[PDB]
Each structure stands twice: as C-alpha cells, then as structure tokens.
Design an enzyme around this catalytic site. Structure first.
Site, PDB file in Angstrom:
ATOM      1  N   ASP A  61      -5.220   6.047  -0.863  1.00  9.92           N
ATOM      2  CA  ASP A  61      -4.535   5.368   0.234  1.00  9.92           C
ATOM      3  C   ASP A  61      -3.425   6.220   0.846  1.00  9.92           C
ATOM      4  O   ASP A  61      -2.517   5.663   1.479  1.00  9.92           O
ATOM      5  CB  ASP A  61      -3.947   4.018  -0.231  1.00  9.92           C
ATOM      6  CG  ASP A  61      -4.885   2.810   0.016  1.00  9.92           C
ATOM      7  OD1 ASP A  61      -5.770   2.845   0.919  1.00  9.92           O
ATOM      8  OD2 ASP A  61      -4.709   1.789  -0.688  1.00  9.92           O
ATOM      9  N   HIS A  75       0.849  -1.205   0.000  1.00 12.92           N
ATOM     10  CA  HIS A  75       0.000   0.000   0.000  1.00 12.92           C
ATOM     11  C   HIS A  75       0.882   1.252   0.000  1.00 12.92           C
ATOM     12  O   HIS A  75       1.094   1.911   1.020  1.00 12.92           O
ATOM     13  CB  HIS A  75      -0.968  -0.017   1.182  1.00 12.92           C
ATOM     14  CG  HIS A  75      -1.997  -1.101   1.095  1.00 12.92           C
ATOM     15  ND1 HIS A  75      -1.896  -2.288   1.791  1.00 12.92           N
ATOM     16  CD2 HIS A  75      -3.108  -1.208   0.329  1.00 12.92           C
ATOM     17  CE1 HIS A  75      -2.919  -3.064   1.480  1.00 12.92           C
ATOM     18  NE2 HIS A  75      -3.663  -2.435   0.585  1.00 12.92           N
TER      19      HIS A  75
HETATM   20  C1  LIG Z   1      -2.532 -10.230  -6.667  1.00 11.44           C
HETATM   21  O1  LIG Z   1      -3.169 -10.311  -5.383  1.00 11.44           O
HETATM   22  C2  LIG Z   1      -3.613  -9.140  -4.807  1.00 11.44           C
HETATM   23  C3  LIG Z   1      -3.541  -7.869  -5.351  1.00 11.44           C
HETATM   24  C4  LIG Z   1      -4.057  -6.784  -4.649  1.00 11.44           C
HETATM   25  C5  LIG Z   1      -4.652  -6.907  -3.390  1.00 11.44           C
HETATM   26  C6  LIG Z   1      -4.717  -8.195  -2.811  1.00 11.44           C
HETATM   27  C7  LIG Z   1      -5.215  -8.751  -1.578  1.00 11.44           C
HETATM   28  C8  LIG Z   1      -5.010 -10.103  -1.647  1.00 11.44           C
HETATM   29  C9  LIG Z   1      -5.358 -11.217  -0.698  1.00 11.44           C
HETATM   30  C10 LIG Z   1      -4.208 -11.802   0.080  1.00 11.44           C
HETATM   31  C11 LIG Z   1      -3.736 -11.166   1.216  1.00 11.44           C
HETATM   32  C12 LIG Z   1      -2.643 -11.650   1.901  1.00 11.44           C
HETATM   33  C13 LIG Z   1      -2.022 -12.786   1.448  1.00 11.44           C
HETATM   34 CL1  LIG Z   1      -0.648 -13.402   2.319  1.00 11.44          CL
HETATM   35  C14 LIG Z   1      -2.478 -13.455   0.332  1.00 11.44           C
HETATM   36  C15 LIG Z   1      -3.574 -12.958  -0.345  1.00 11.44           C
HETATM   37  N1  LIG Z   1      -4.391 -10.417  -2.830  1.00 11.44           N
HETATM   38  C16 LIG Z   1      -4.203  -9.274  -3.556  1.00 11.44           C
HETATM   39  C17 LIG Z   1      -5.726  -7.900  -0.450  1.00 11.44           C
HETATM   40  C18 LIG Z   1      -4.972  -6.576  -0.585  1.00 11.44           C
HETATM   41  N2  LIG Z   1      -5.546  -5.554  -1.517  1.00 11.44           N
HETATM   42  C19 LIG Z   1      -5.137  -5.617  -2.798  1.00 11.44           C
HETATM   43  O2  LIG Z   1      -5.139  -4.623  -3.522  1.00 11.44           O
HETATM   44 MG   LIG Z   2      -7.204   1.212   0.779  1.00 13.06          MG
HETATM   45 ZN   LIG Z   3      -6.002   0.597  -2.057  1.00 18.33          ZN
END
Ligand SMILES: COc1ccc2c3c(c(Cc4ccc(Cl)cc4)[nH]c13)CCNC2=O
Ligand SMILES: [Mg+2]
Ligand SMILES: [Zn+2]
Length: 287
Positions: free
Chosen positions: A118, A77
């Site tokens: 963000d 982020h």
């Molecule tokens: C290409 O994947 C992703 C690309 C973007 C995001 C996210 C998320 C996830 C889920 C997740 C969280 C922790 C772990 Cl360890 C694994 C999987 N995957 C994502 C939530 C975070 N917001 C996102 O923008």
């Molecule tokens: Mg956000």
């Molecule tokens: Zn965001």
C-alpha cells in the site's frame, strides 16, 4: 540518518520476545523503531538474510524507506497497516505452517509485497492504485543503498519481481472477488494442488488478501480499535458500524479464512478470531 544509525546499531530480539509469531499480535505499544526491528526479525527468521546475502545497513535502510513512504496523515492505510500485514504473513508462514508449501523466492516476494503493498496510500476518500503501490515498491527497491535483492541472480531477480507485482495487484479487492470463486471451488472438491503453477499463483493472491484483511481476526479490544481507524479514514477523510462490520465479515472475510483453514489447519486462529468478532458485532447490531 539519525534514525538509521540507531536502527542499524540495535540488537534484534528474538521472534518470541517480539511476539511476531502470534496471530493475535498487536502494534499499538511499539514505536516506529520497534516495528522496524520486528521487520528485520521477520526477514532474519525466514532466513531471507543469509539465503540472499542481504547486508544489514541495506535491509535497515530499505525498511526505513518503505516506512517513510507511507503517509502518517492517513488514519488506517499507513505504515502500521502494512507492518501488520507483514506480521500476519510471518505468522501464517510460521505458526500457520505455510512456509513449507512455498519456495524461498515466493516467501521473499510475499514479505516484500506485504510490507510494500500500500506504499503511498493517501486515504480512500482521496486497479489503478495497486499499480501505483507496486511502482513505489520497485522504485524503493532500486534506490542505491536499499537494494535488498542485489544478491539474487538475474533469473531469481526476474522471478521475484514478477511475484511481488502479482502479489500487490492481488490486494485489489475487486481482483479478490473476481478470483475467489475458483479458489473456493477447488477447495470444496479436494482438487486443490499447489504444484499446479496456476493454483500456486492463485493461492499466493488469496494469502495476500487474508493477510491484508487480518485486523478483522484480532482479539476484540484490538480489532475494535482498528475499526476506529477505519471509520476515521472512511468518514472523517483523515450506530451503523456494527452492521457494516457484520456485512463486511460475511461478504468478504469469512469464506477466505475458511478456505485458508483447509489449506493449513494451523491458520484456524484467523478463522476463530474472525468468528468471535462477528458474534460480538452481531450482538451490538441488535442494540
Ligand atoms: C476491523 O475492521 C476492518 C479492518 C480492516 C479493514 C476493514 C474494512 C472494513 C469495512 C468498513 C469500512 C468503513 C466503515 Cl465506516 C466500517 C467498516 N472494516 C475493516 C475495509 C478496509 N480494509 C481493511 O483492511
Ligand atoms: Mg490496499
Ligand atoms: Zn491494504
């Protein structure tokens, strides 16, 4: 000031040369200064610069303020996630041909919101946050030298600020899961109508969330690298992943990109890319 001088002097290559119209865009090879140029091109090619009389060094300075107030120390982020959210908003407006369905102030607000949504995130392990992100956004917007809305009338300014705030708040996934039933609802009954002010605001929220999440739609090698940043931020506060990825895609992502494809069939590459990733993750999940 050293960085602002280079940025303001540079020529801004076309949208084509920068590739910002592609849903498959990636930022890994760009320096901070190049994402800055990409960002000016987004404003310029949505004709936000002329329609609202933005001055070049102000826009430039505003982008660098936004970038500075993301934290380099956060693995996902950060400015690049924000820069990517704005690139997908650009792509969905152009290539996805959503631009024509919205007004100038909505588009100005969406792009500002995507870039700002963000601001000053410090990492998941560190709707409270979104109000803070909007706070940062407005603060920077009011800093002298950065005031890219100064050319808007007071009524335009008030309308644009309201939309910006709604759009950033909408990036709370809890707000997205609360509201998407209604959205999916109107799409399945062919009742969806952007001319209703309630459904307009609702769509804008859903488009913000689709851009926010859109790393999940990228080509597999890009998407897998983004996934490593996510895993880094969530675990390291700085075997199980493929099933989490499939669980996240099913629970959060697919229906949204499906719904959005009905509103504009040219957003289908986001759905297409999401689908390819789910199968590739599924395959790995089966070991
Ligand atoms: C290409 O994947 C992703 C690309 C973007 C995001 C996210 C998320 C996830 C889920 C997740 C969280 C922790 C772990 Cl360890 C694994 C999987 N995957 C994502 C939530 C975070 N917001 C996102 O923008
Ligand atoms: Mg956000
Ligand atoms: Zn965001």
């Amino acid at each position: 000031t050293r960085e602002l001088q280079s940025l303001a002097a540079a020529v801004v290559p076309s949208a084509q040369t920068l590739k910002i119209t592609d849903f498959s865009f990636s930022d890994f090879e760009l320096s901070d200064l190049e994402t800055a140029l990409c960002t000016i091109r987004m404003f310029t090619d949505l004709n936000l610069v002329q329609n609202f009389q933005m001055k070049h060094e102000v826009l430039c300075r505003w982008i660098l303020s936004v970038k500075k107030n993301y934290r380099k120390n956060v693995a996902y982020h950060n400015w690049r996630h924000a820069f990517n959210t704005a690139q997908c908003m650009f792509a969905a407006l152009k290539a996805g041909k959503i631009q024509n369905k919205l007004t100038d102030l909505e588009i100005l607000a969406l792009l500002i919101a995507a870039l700002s949504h963000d601001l000053d995130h410090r990492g998941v392990n560190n709707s409270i946050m979104e109000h803070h992100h909007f706070d940062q956004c407005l603060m920077i917007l009011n800093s002298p030298g950065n005031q890219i809305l100064s050319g808007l009338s007071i009524e335009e300014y008030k309308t644009t600020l309201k939309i910006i705030k709604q759009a950033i708040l909408a990036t709370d996934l809890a707000l997205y899961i609360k509201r998407r039933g209604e959205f999916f609802e109107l799409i399945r009954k062919n009742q969806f109508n952007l001319e209703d002010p309630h459904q307009k605001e609702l769509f804008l929220a859903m488009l913000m969330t689709a851009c926010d999440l859109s790393a999940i739609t990228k080509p597999w090698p890009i998407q897998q690298r983004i996934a490593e940043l996510v895993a880094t931020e969530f675990f390291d506060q700085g075997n199980k992943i493929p099933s989490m990825q499939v669980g996240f895609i099913d629970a959060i992502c697919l229906q949204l990109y499906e719904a959005l494809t009905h509103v504009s069939e040219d957003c289908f590459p986001l759905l297409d890319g999401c689908r390819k990733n789910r199968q590739k993750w599924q395959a790995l999940a089966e070991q």
